[PDB]
């Protein structure tokens, strides 16, 4: 029974890309992409998103 | 086949936290000489 400050999916249509400063890319692994990566031997390593919170070790 | 509902425990905040108005300038408090109004509490929005 209140409003929603009339938030209805801000729509980026006229795109002047990047209307927000850019924050030099930090130097480490998992802060560039969200790709399926790879391990030394050749096993697949899941994207940086999830499944890499509970570290798995043999 | 029914079951009991979840247990809900309504209760005041620990140390009645939040009841008073702190760190929220807007509705802040005051302490001064009744005839020399000069606050004793000036609040920032960042003091938690």
């Amino acid at each position: 029974m209140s409003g929603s400050m009339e938030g209805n999916a801000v729509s980026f249509k006229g795109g002047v890309f990047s209307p927000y400063l850019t924050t030099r890319l930090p130097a480490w692994a998992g802060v560039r992409q969200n790709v399926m990566g790879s391990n030394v031997d050749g096993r697949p390593v899941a994207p940086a998103n999830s499944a890499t919170l509970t570290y798995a070790t043999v | 086949q029914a079951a009991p509902n979840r247990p809900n425990y309504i209760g005041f905040r620990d140390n009645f936290i939040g009841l008073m108005y702190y760190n929220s300038t807007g509705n802040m408090g005051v302490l001064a000489g009744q005839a020399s109004q000069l606050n004793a509490v000036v609040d920032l929005q960042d003091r938690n």
Binding site: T22, L25, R32, Q33 | -
Partner: protein, 97 residues
């Protein structure tokens, strides 16, 4: 048939340079305007932006600040080496460390 032109400027294996010198000349490794009084006594922030042809493949910028990276290495006694690193405009260490 009729015809409308097109042109590019393919330039690869080279990096763009915007030297800090007043007249953009190679008048010295430590530039003329670099030593100027105004920049030598009062720091400045910087805002500066680029264009890019839209490439659907994600891409990341690459910028350098042409900063002195000098080093001095001295050996006082047999078997002891002492070094001093420095980066005048972008020093790698200051009073906070």
């Amino acid at each position: 048939v009729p015809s409308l032109t097109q042109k590019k400027f393919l330039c690869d294996r080279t990096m763009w340079r915007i030297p800090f010198s007043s007249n953009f000349m190679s008048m010295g490794a430590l530039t003329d305007l670099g030593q100027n009084m105004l920049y030598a006594n009062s720091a400045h922030a910087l805002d500066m932006t680029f264009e890019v042809d839209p490439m659907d493949e994600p891409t990341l910028l690459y910028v350098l600040f042409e900063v002195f990276d000098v080093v001095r290495i001295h050996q006082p006694h047999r078997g002891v080496i002492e070094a001093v690193y420095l980066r005048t405009p972008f020093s790698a260490g200051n009073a906070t460390t």
